[PDB]
Amino acid sequence: QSLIDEDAVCSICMDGESQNSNVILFCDMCNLAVHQECYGVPYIPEGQWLCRHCLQSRARPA
Ligand SMILES: [Zn+2]
Ligand SMILES: [Zn+2]
């Protein structure tokens, strides 16, 4: 075994199933998990994911 889950469940649909059509992306700060299709994102980005609270947090200092 490796890990238990660490927020391995989507919030928009409460489904922790990482699939091609709906990949449950993990944040970078808070560690929120949500399918890129569930949140409303075109697809998987280059780096990680930053929720509106996440990006807004780091956006301050920049
Ligand atoms: Zn979802
Ligand atoms: Zn976040």
Q: Calculate ∠ Cα 25-61-39, nearest 5°.
A: 20
Q: Are 30 and 53 in contact (CB under 8 A)?
A: yes
CA of 54 to the centre of ligand 2 (A): 4
**Which tokens go with 57?**
């947090």
Domain 1-62 falls under CATH 3.30.40.10:
yes
8 neighbors 34 (Cβ within 8 angstroms): no
Evaluate whether 17 touches 9 at the Cβ level (below 8 Å): no
Residue that the structure tokens 């890990």 belong to: 3
Q: Whose CA is closest to 8, among 43, 44, 17?
A: 17
Q: How far apart are CA 49 and CA 24, in angstroms?
A: 10
Strand partners, 25: 34
Q: Which of the ligands is closest to the CA of residue 10?
A: 1
Beta-carbon count within 10 A of 54 CB: 17
> Encoding tokens for residue 35?
């399918």
Which listed ligand is nearest to 53 at the C-alpha? 2
